[PDB]
Amino acid sequence: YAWNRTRISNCVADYSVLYNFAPFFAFKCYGVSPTKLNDLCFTNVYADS
Amino acid sequence: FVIKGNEVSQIAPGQTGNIADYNYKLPDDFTGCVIAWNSNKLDSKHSGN
């Protein structure tokens, strides 16, 4: 009801690290495929937790 | 092959994870069936298999 928003910027991403933090129930992307996020992550990035 | 349950969902023609990415890879335009059976009663061991 009071979800958190973290702003991600001025970084180099690297999304393979996200497979180390936890096993996932779901990892569903819209407009981009899971396999290509290392590139194509751009503009405002926000993590809704 | 024998795979663990949390990676069975990684066997789709296109998907990510350590199995989909590094151990068994299917073509994305593949025709066929991936048929799964629970073998806990046969493959598991008390000391570990």
Side-chain angles (χ1 to χ4, degrees):
Chain A
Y1 90 98
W3 51 270
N4 205 13
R5 172 163 282 197
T6 297
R7 183 168 189 268
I8 298 170
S9 71
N10 300 17
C11 52
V12 160
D14 212 318
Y15 290 89
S16 68
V17 304
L18 303 204
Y19 293 95
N20 295 329
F21 297 149
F24 298 126
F25 176 41
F27 195 123
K28 283 206 60 172
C29 298
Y30 302 89
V32 64
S33 293
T35 74
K36 295 182 175 287
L37 288 313
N38 284 68
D39 187 356
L40 295 174
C41 55
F42 287 96
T43 310
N44 322 293
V45 174
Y46 292 122
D48 292 335
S49 295
Chain B
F1 55 109
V2 153
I3 193 53
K4 65 184 183 181
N6 283 332
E7 298 184 333
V8 172
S9 322
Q10 290 184 29
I11 209 70
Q15 178 63 290
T16 62
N18 50 15
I19 300 300
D21 296 313
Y22 305 124
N23 264 138
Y24 182 82
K25 185 78 175 181
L26 265 175
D28 301 349
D29 60 348
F30 176 80
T31 59
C33 301
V34 181
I35 302 173
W37 175 227
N38 72 266
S39 62
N40 186 60
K41 68 146 181 39
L42 301 178
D43 296 318
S44 296
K45 303 292 176 194
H46 294 79
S47 65
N49 186 329

